[PDB]
Design a protein around this ligand. Sequence first.
Ligand SMILES: O=C(O)[C@H]1O[C@@H](O[C@H]2[C@H](O)[C@H](O)[C@H](O[C@H]3[C@H](O)[C@H](O)[C@H](O[C@H]4[C@H](O)[C@H](O)[C@H](O[C@H]5[C@H](O)[C@H](O)[C@H](O[C@H]6[C@H](O)[C@H](O)[C@H](O[C@H]7[C@H](O)[C@H](O)[C@H](O)O[C@@H]7C(=O)O)O[C@@H]6C(=O)O)O[C@@H]5C(=O)O)O[C@@H]4C(=O)O)O[C@@H]3C(=O)O)O[C@@H]2C(=O)O)[C@@H](O)[C@@H](O)[C@@H]1O
Length: 227
Amino acid sequence: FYTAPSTESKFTEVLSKAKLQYPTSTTVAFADDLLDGYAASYFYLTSDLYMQFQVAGSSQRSELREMETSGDEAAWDCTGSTAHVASAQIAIPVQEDGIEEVTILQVHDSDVTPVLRISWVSSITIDGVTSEDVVLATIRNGIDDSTATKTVLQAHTTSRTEFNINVQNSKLSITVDGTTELDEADISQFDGSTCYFKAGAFNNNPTDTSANARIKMYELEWVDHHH
Ligand SMILES: O=C(O)[C@H]1O[C@@H](O[C@H]2[C@H](O)[C@H](O)[C@H](O[C@H]3[C@H](O)[C@H](O)[C@H](O[C@H]4[C@H](O)[C@H](O)[C@H](O[C@H]5[C@H](O)[C@H](O)[C@H](O[C@H]6[C@H](O)[C@H](O)[C@H](O[C@H]7[C@H](O)[C@H](O)[C@H](O)O[C@@H]7C(=O)O)O[C@@H]6C(=O)O)O[C@@H]5C(=O)O)O[C@@H]4C(=O)O)O[C@@H]3C(=O)O)O[C@@H]2C(=O)O)[C@@H](O)[C@@H](O)[C@@H]1O
């Protein structure tokens, strides 16, 4: 009884360029499945035309992963000359009790390292400063360094918010509602890696493993701009 995101033409292109992973890194729906009306409790269209992702459990996900129309996985040069841009209009509801962090957009390398996570966090402490109920950028310092540089991007609102990730040469920028919030962060530690975008709900370190993380996207796309 769930309506499919594919019923909205605004999602046709990104779904053609995606596969859906749930609840782990296994594919539940490829692009052609998504375009044929795939819908489930963890991936459906709301009555006001949001693509909603929902998932429970530690490090579980309902997430779109960038694909080429050819069916190849996206694997662009992480620090190449071609610009890669992901844009999304996201409404982050107040999260259920026991949900402590939800990753909503990523740049991921083609192995086991996220270049960038954009996530909602119940709290974070950075250089001795604690912020609560904020949206955060996390950029890993390298494949062999588990630590990351963290940047508060936005106070959490339930309002629809525009996020834009721009990746070109060895630099990554994030704009939130038109304002640059991370300006040309260095990602040269991923020289020689290949990369792809992800978007959805990725549930990080819940304190209630049966609570549902929930994230809504009004618009989503990922594109190339050739230099
Ligand atoms: O400052 C402080 O507060 C403290 O910070 C502390 O340190 C922090 C860090 O700062 C940071 O916050 C860190 O965050 C971690 C997150 O919490 C979270 O755990 C995150 O999890 C990652 C995970 O590490 C992996 O990278 C994982 O990768 C998966 C991918 O997303 C993707 O789904 C992959 O899908 C592939 C499949 O796995 C298969 O390989 C599949 O195979 C296909 C082949 O391509 C082939 O074609 C074949 O033939 O067909 C198959 C097929 O189709 O099936 O391909 C797919 C594919 O699509 O590519 O799978 C990956 C996987 O292996 O699982 O993803 C998540 C993610 O980001 O999504 O990791 C974060 C991190 O480690 O950075 O947490 C730290 C912490 O908490 O400790 C401290 O420094 C502290 O001191 C500070 O105070």
